[PDB]
Every structure is written in C-alpha cells, then in structure tokens.
Design a protein around this ligand. Structure first.
Ligand SMILES: NC(=O)c1ccc[n+]([C@@H]2O[C@H](COP(=O)([O-])OP(=O)(O)OC[C@H]3O[C@@H](n4cnc5c(N)ncnc54)[C@H](OP(=O)(O)O)[C@@H]3O)[C@@H](O)[C@H]2O)c1
Ligand SMILES: NC(=O)c1ccc[n+]([C@@H]2O[C@H](COP(=O)([O-])OP(=O)(O)OC[C@H]3O[C@@H](n4cnc5c(N)ncnc54)[C@H](OP(=O)(O)O)[C@@H]3O)[C@@H](O)[C@H]2O)c1
Ligand SMILES: CC(C)(O)c1cccn2c(C3(c4ccc(Cl)cc4)CC3)nnc12
Ligand SMILES: CC(C)(O)c1cccn2c(C3(c4ccc(Cl)cc4)CC3)nnc12
Ligand SMILES: CC(C)(O)c1cccn2c(C3(c4ccc(Cl)cc4)CC3)nnc12
Ligand SMILES: CC(C)(O)c1cccn2c(C3(c4ccc(Cl)cc4)CC3)nnc12
Lengths: 265, 265
C-alpha cells in the first residue's frame, strides 16, 4: 500500500512536544493535509504561534493545551480534553522529551527519574487514556524513539534507558492488540540525528555526525503511522534498518506465542 | 579463558533479592566458593535463614541488611553499609524484582511506576553507589535480566519495559567504562524461564514452556560475571543467544564511536 495525503484529511490527531523541532513540523504537515490537530508542550506562547501557522497552512481545526508531562494527572486529563475538543481521536503522536545534555553518567539519579517519568511513564499514561477512543476509530499511536532506543552510545544512558523502555512496553502492547483482534496500530519511529536546534546545540563539539532534515523526518513519521507499519527507521544510512532490524527477535516473538494459552485472549 | 571456583574465594560480593529463587542459589554457590557475602531482601527472617546456611556452606563471612528497594535512600545506604561490612566490594549482583503477575495490560500506572522504581531505578542507584569501590578492586556488576529484556511477549509489558531499560542504561555504562579505561566489567544476564516457586506459580495455566533449574542458572550467572563477559544467555534452547544476540547492534555501536571527540574520555 502507498501513502496519500488524503489519508489524513479530517483525521483527529494529537501531537505532544509540538512547540518546536520534529513535533512542530508534524503539526505543519498534518495541517497541510487538512487534519484536526490538538497540540501540547509547556510553552503556551510557542503553542499559540504554531496553532496560528497551522490554521494558515490549512488545518481543519487547531487547538492547544499547555502543560508539563512531568505531571501524570495533566498527561491523562490532556487526552480526555483533546478527545472532547475534536469529538474523537484517530492518531496519537507521542513525541515530547524532557531536556537532557550529553554527559558521561556520574550520579544524577533525580535526572534519571525525570527522564523515565517524562520520556517513558507519560507515554504509557496517554496511550492508556487514548485507547478507548482509538479502539472506536480503529486508530494509531506513533511512539517517537531513536537509534539510542535500539542500540547504545556514550553520554546518553538515561535517555537510551527511556527509549529502550518504550520499545519493551509498546511492542508488548502491539502484540497484545493483534492477538485480542483490536485494530489499533502502534508505530515505533526509530530516528537518527535530526536538524533540530536543541539536538544540534546539544551535540556541538561532542559529536561529528551529519543530521537529517526535520521536515522530511516529520513527514516520514506521519506516512509510516498512517500506513500502520510496526516500525519506521529514519536516518541517513540505508544500512540502519538492516543493522538494527533484529529479525532474530522477530522469529523468537512469533515462535514463543505457541506456549501461551489461546483462551487468555 | 576458563572458570575456576578459586576466582571467587575471598571476594566481597553483594547479592540483592537473596531470600529466595535465583538470589538464594547465588548466595549458596558464592558461600561454597568461599566468598564474603552481603545479602538483601525485605524479609529479615528469610535473610537470617539463608545467612545461616551460607555460613554452614563455607562462606568466608555472611551478612544481611533487610529493606525495600522501593526506597532509593535505602538502596544507596545498603551499598555504603555492605561495603564497610566487608571493607570493600569485588562484585555487585543486582537481582531483586518487585512482584508482578501475568496480565494483559489494562491500566495501573502506579504498578508501572513501582516496576520501574524497583526493577530499574534501584539498580542505577546501587551501581552508582558501588562504583567507587568497584573502581578500586577492578570489580564487576551482574545485571539480572530476561529474554523479555531482549524481545517481547504478551502479559508482561511493565516488566519487559524495565528489563529493556536496564539493557539501554548498563550497555551505555559498560561502553563508558571501557572508553575511559576503567577496568570494571558489566554482565547483563539474559535468562529464560527458571523453575523458581514464584515463576512456576505465575505461568501456571497461562504459559506451557519448560523451565530451567535455578541452581544451574545461579552458577552460570556467577561464572559469566567472574569471567567478565558482556552478556550471559541462560536458557533451554542453544538458539537463543544466536537469535537474540543482535550482532548488527554491536557493529553499529563500534562504528558510531568514530564520531565522538576522543578528548571527552
Ligand atoms: N532531534 C534529534 O536529533 C532526535 C534524534 C533521535 C530521536 N529524536 C526524538 O524525536 C522527538 C522530538 O525531538 P526534537 O529534537 O524535535 O525535540 P525538541 O526540539 O527539544 O522538542 C521537544 C518538545 O517537547 C517539549 N517538552 C519538553 N519538556 C517537556 C515537558 N516537561 N513536558 C511536556 N513537553 C515537554 C518541548 O516544548 P517545551 O520546552 O515548550 O515544553 C518541545 O516542543 C523526541 O521523542 C526525540 O527523542 C530526536
Ligand atoms: N524465575 C524466572 O523464571 C526468571 C526468568 C527470567 C529472568 N528472571 C530474573 O531473575 C531474577 C530473580 O528472579 P526470581 O524468579 O528468582 O525471583 P523471586 O523468587 O520472586 O525472588 C525475588 C527476590 O527479590 C526480593 N524482593 C521482592 N520485592 C522486593 C523489594 N520491594 N525490595 C527488595 N527486594 C525485593 C524477594 O524477597 P522479599 O519478598 O523477601 O523482599 C526475593 O528475594 C530477577 O531479576 C528476574 O527478573 C527470572
Ligand atoms: C539516537 C542517536 C542517533 O544515536 C543519537 C546520538 C546522539 C545524540 N542524539 C540525540 C540528541 C540527545 C539525546 C540525548 C541527550 Cl542526553 C542529549 C541529546 C541530540 C538530540 N538524539 N538521538 C541521538
Ligand atoms: C523472559 C521470558 C522467558 O520471556 C519470560 C516469559 C514469561 C514469564 N517470565 C517470567 C516470570 C514473570 C515475569 C513477568 C511477570 Cl508480569 C510475571 C512473571 C515468570 C517469572 N520471567 N521471565 C519470563
Ligand atoms: C513462552 C515464553 C516463556 O514466553 C518464551 C519466550 C521466549 C522464548 N521461549 C522459548 C524458547 C525458544 C522459543 C522459540 C525459538 Cl525459535 C527459540 C527458543 C527458549 C526455548 N520457549 N518459551 C519461550
Ligand atoms: C554518532 C552517533 C550520532 O551517535 C551515531 C549513532 C548511531 C549511528 N550513527 C551513524 C550512522 C551509521 C553508523 C555506522 C554504521 Cl555501521 C551504520 C550507520 C547512521 C549513519 N552516524 N552517527 C551515528
């Protein structure tokens, strides 16, 4: 099956971490496709600015609810509100991350808790809150991850821990939805280094690799999620999906189901 | 190189979750090898019983400090105390897990938080607290994981999330120790189904797979950690380490270091 921008015309989409970077670009692409969009981040001003441009780009409707994903009550309330604002949900885009700087791990335990809370726990809170709505529309979740969520690199231990945690959790949920015959798709988006100002600022003088453009990245996520793919790899090397693909895991995953009591689902 | 039980004679070892299952078996094996051992779990009574048998089995010294790994201050204090009790640390065995039952994920954010806190955060708290001592003895950490920490299955989403998180974190730490020329080894132990009373009581009527013996399991962990292996796979099928090994990840991990400023380490 091939992608059509028509697939997102009139769809009700949530985009977290939408005030800058990849999130803002997804907001923009979704608007040009004519979707109903509800955006979130902490910066009320930044969200206001992107909602304006969204309406201008051709968004069916554009809403925002500012807040921190450090608060689990906020994370779940946000979904309920957004769902009411659009009268449903077709696609949930879990994209925000808490701030992290490249550092050889030393003793920041409070940073590690904040990373797990924002980058991991909030995503499970929101997916659980959005699932009844998504079950109705036969919807989709896009879980934004990284190469650091499939492999390891120095100076990003807490971050890598959170992206790995998302893979572990959402891959279990995906399998669970499939075996219970629930038509809700889960797309884990494995991203390489991207053009975002925050990313580029963070790596400066530490990492030398070339970054991919944020606009193309945002579109590849949307396309992949719309096409209901389990995984999307977006990175400069075409070797990355073959190297990180892990068909061995896929074989083990399929074969292991033979030991489960089918009555459980 | 090949393993000798002499390698653990007089070594100062910490074993978490040592009142039953694999932890108690590791305690026993370590005692028979003549090591100094400090054990922890919540049950003060259970720890007392295993310390008695440890002394009887031939332990150089055997101590215990009861408590919950839900408390991060306890987790950190425990390491400090245990290190003082033995006058050093040669091997840290992170094994405890919070209680989890096989269930298709519904909700229970509070359970997910507890799982991440106990199964993941406490391990990072303890490894950070033990690292100065381990740096001195050119020591080792054994991080106990599962097949569910390398691949996915139904009904164990929070648990799988925590084991995946450990891989993400500790693989970063391992690489960091190597590049900073610090001779501390990290052994991730990927375990299949083990015949613990707790494991067999959870999979009953749900899962039909054969379990491996806990005594052999405990010894394979100790052997692997002593031999300073990055990963130990212990499971009934000899296919498991080939299927879950992911050499592609290993290739990308090595090659990607070419982009880091070597001056950072
Ligand atoms: N850029 C890359 O090179 C790269 C590489 C691989 C993967 N990724 C993944 O791509 C996604 C987007 O990354 P990006 O580089 O575009 O990020 P970015 O420019 O820093 O944007 C992060 C977004 O999250 C929001 N946010 C930050 N803290 C928050 C909090 N406490 N609660 C709620 N929202 C919060 C930010 O807005 P506020 O500050 O206003 O709240 C912002 O809109 C992430 O999931 C990241 O893991 C990025
Ligand atoms: N058994 C298997 O089939 C299997 C398979 C794959 C991997 N594994 C891994 O193997 C390791 C050992 O598992 P097991 O089956 O031997 O477990 P087990 O029999 O349930 O023992 C868990 C241990 O952790 C302690 N513990 C529980 N809650 C705790 C808490 N809040 N704070 C501190 N300690 C706590 C328990 O004692 P208290 O209750 O007295 O605190 C007990 O000593 C785990 O890391 C597990 O992930 C096991
Ligand atoms: C995933 C990949 C390609 O391996 C990767 C490597 C290095 C940096 N990456 C980042 C940023 C980041 C992450 C974590 C922290 Cl602590 C700081 C900044 C720059 C945004 N996102 N992905 C990557
Ligand atoms: C790792 C492996 C082989 O895929 C696996 C499959 C199934 C059960 N496993 C378990 C137990 C467990 C785990 C999580 C919860 Cl919620 C409950 C009970 C039985 C102990 N440990 N590992 C496994
Ligand atoms: C059912 C359970 C416990 O969740 C499970 C998970 C993962 C592996 N399991 C296996 C083995 C296996 C299966 C298929 C292949 Cl191709 C290879 C090896 C190790 C024997 N048996 N049961 C399981
Ligand atoms: C340095 C950084 C950002 O952490 C990083 C992490 C992971 C992959 N990276 C790559 C690519 C690559 C490298 C080696 C091979 Cl064999 C294949 C593909 C994708 C181009 N370039 N930089 C990185």
């Amino acid at each position: 099956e091939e992608f059509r921008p028509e697939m997102l015309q009139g769809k009700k989409v949530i985009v977290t971490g939408a005030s800058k970077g990849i999130g803002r670009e997804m907001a923009y692409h979704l608007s040009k496709m004519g979707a109903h969009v509800v955006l979130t981040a902490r910066s009320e001003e930044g969200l206001q600015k992107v909602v304006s441009r969204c309406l201008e780009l051709g968004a069916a409707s554009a809403h925002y609810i500012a807040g921190t994903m450090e608060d689990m009550t906020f994370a779940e309330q946000f979904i309920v509100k957004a769902g009411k604002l659009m009268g449903g949900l077709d696609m949930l885009i879990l994209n925000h991350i808490t701030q992290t700087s490249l550092s050889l791990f030393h003793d920041d335990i409070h940073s590690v808790r904040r990373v797990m809370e924002v980058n991991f726990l909030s995503y499970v809170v929101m997916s659980t809150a959005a699932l009844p709505m998504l079950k109705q529309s036969n919807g989709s979740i896009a879980v934004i991850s990284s190469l650091a969520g499939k492999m390891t690199q120095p100076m990003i231990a807490p971050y890598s821990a959170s992206k790995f945690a998302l893979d572990g959790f959402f891959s279990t949920i995906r399998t669970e939805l499939y075996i219970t015959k629930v038509n809700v798709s889960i797309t884990l988006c494995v991203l390489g280094l991207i053009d975002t100002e925050t990313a580029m600022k963070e790596i400066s003088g530490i990492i030398n690799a070339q970054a991919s453009p944020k606009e193309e990245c945002a579109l590849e996520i949307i396309k992949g999620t719309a096409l209901r793919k389990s995984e999307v790899y977006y990175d400069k090397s075409p070797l990355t999906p073959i190297l990180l693909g892990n068909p061995g895991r896929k074989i083990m995953e399929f074969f292991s189901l033979r030991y489960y009591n089918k009555d459980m689902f």
